[PDB]
Amino acid sequence: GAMAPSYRVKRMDIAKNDEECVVNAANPRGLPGDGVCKAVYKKWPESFKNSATPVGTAKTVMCGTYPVIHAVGPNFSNYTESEGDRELAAAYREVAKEVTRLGVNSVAIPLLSTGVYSGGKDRLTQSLNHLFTAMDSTDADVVIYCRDKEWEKKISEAIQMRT
């Protein structure tokens, strides 16, 4: 575990993370995809061997010894708000199980279902709160990655609010 488990946020490419493992915002088919998924495919392509997994699940594949946790959030274009919300919460719970199982002291994590899978809605708070619900019981240092300057400020505020 981390000596004093923390949350932090950085605005940069998660492919350049300084953590012991990465969470991919994957698609169910293990395809290269777009956004975080395409960055992850360029950096750790070996981790896409048999990475296909259903919505609401996470599947870890090692790139060398570096674990890539493929977490499949729902595409809110296809899911109802209710069912999507359930699957988005479930994906993060499966991430927390994998992070625990791996024994890592740190994990780089994007906000699932906030990009192409957001169905055109701002889901920062929804996705971040499901991240916290899952990860709060873990003792890994969590570093959240984002690309937008206003998102960085809002995520940072949310982290600082809980102290």
Binding residues for ADP-D-ribose: 13, 27, 35, 115-117
83 binds Cl ion (CB under 5 A): no
Give me the least distance between CB of 33 and Cl ion, in Å please: 9
Work out whether 42 is an interface residue with Cl ion (CB under 5 A). Answer: no
Q: Phi and psi for 107 in degrees, rounded to 5?
A: -150, 135
Determine which residue in the list 1, 6, 12, 160 makes contact with Cl ion, applying CB under 5 A.
12
Token pair for 114:
């906030």
Range 99-118, binding Cl ion (CB under 5 A)? 115, 117
Q: Work out how close the CB of 123 gets to Cl ion at its nearest, in angstroms, rounded to a whole number.
A: 9
Nearer to Cl ion, 9 or 61 (CB): 9
Least distance (Å) between residue 3 CB and Cl ion: 28
15-50 b/e with 16+ CB inside 10 Å = b?
bebebbbbbbbbbbebeebeebbebbbebbeebbee
Task: For residue 88, state whether it binds Cl ion (rule: CB under 5 A).
Answer: no
Is the Cβ of residue 5 or residue 32 nearer to Cl ion in the bound state? 32
Cα(38)–Cα(34) distance, integer angstroms: 5
First to last CA, the chain: 20
Alpha-carbon separation of residue 87 from 56, 75, 83 (angstroms) = 5, 10, 6
Which lies closer to Cl ion via its Cβ, residue 2 or residue 12?
A: 12
Taking Cα atoms as reference points, which of 96, 113, 100 lies closest to residue 25?
113
148 near Cl ion, rule: CB under 5 A = yes
> Where along the sequence are the contacts to Cl ion (CB under 5 A)?
12-13, 115, 117, 146-148, 151
